[PDB]
Amino acid sequence: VNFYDVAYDLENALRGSEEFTRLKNLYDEVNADESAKRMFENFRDVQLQAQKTVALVQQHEKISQLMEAEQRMSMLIGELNKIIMKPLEELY
Amino acid sequence: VNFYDVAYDLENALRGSEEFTRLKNLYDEVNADESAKRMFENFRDVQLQAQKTVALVQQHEKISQLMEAEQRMSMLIGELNKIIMKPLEELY
Ligand SMILES: [Ca+2]
Numbered sequence A, B: 001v002n003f004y005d006v007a008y009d010l011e012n013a014l015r016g017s018e019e020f021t022r023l024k025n026l027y028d029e030v031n032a033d034e035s036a037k038r039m040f041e042n043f044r045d046v047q048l049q050a051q052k053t054v055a056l057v058q059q060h061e062k063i064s065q066l067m068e069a070e071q072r073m074s075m076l077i078g079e080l081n082k083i084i085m086k087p088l089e090e091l092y
């Protein structure tokens, strides 16, 4: 099959996953909370005193849950990459 | 559908692609050439005077073709990632 055809099926799988729904719900929940929205945004912005700002946000339970869901999404993408890149690892 | 189910279909798509076959053929061709194998290996090894070693290998046509095929494979993985991560970009 075509690599791009499958990639679009994989995008759909991600779009439809409970994991994406959970991340989206946390993201919306944080944005609906005026205090949390501001803290999360100032955190995001400071990443382009750091370290920081990370302490500010980690002390907030709901924002921490969102950040944890972000890191788990990053881990998932990492897993997908390890899966699909196996033939390259075999080669080298 | 399940994200992992599709990821394994995508691994199969990559395994079966002419692009993978081309990379593998170049890799094997370089390794079958005693002089080129040594240059490519010393290059790979120097990456963990650099810059370098990169000049050594780029002056060899066949090794350069392999390195170009590597970079195009990296670009392909990049494209797949951009595709599947679109729902995340929409969210943020
Ligand atoms: Ca917690």
Ligand SMILES: [Ca+2]
Binding pocket: B061, B064, B065
């Ligand atoms: Ca050339």
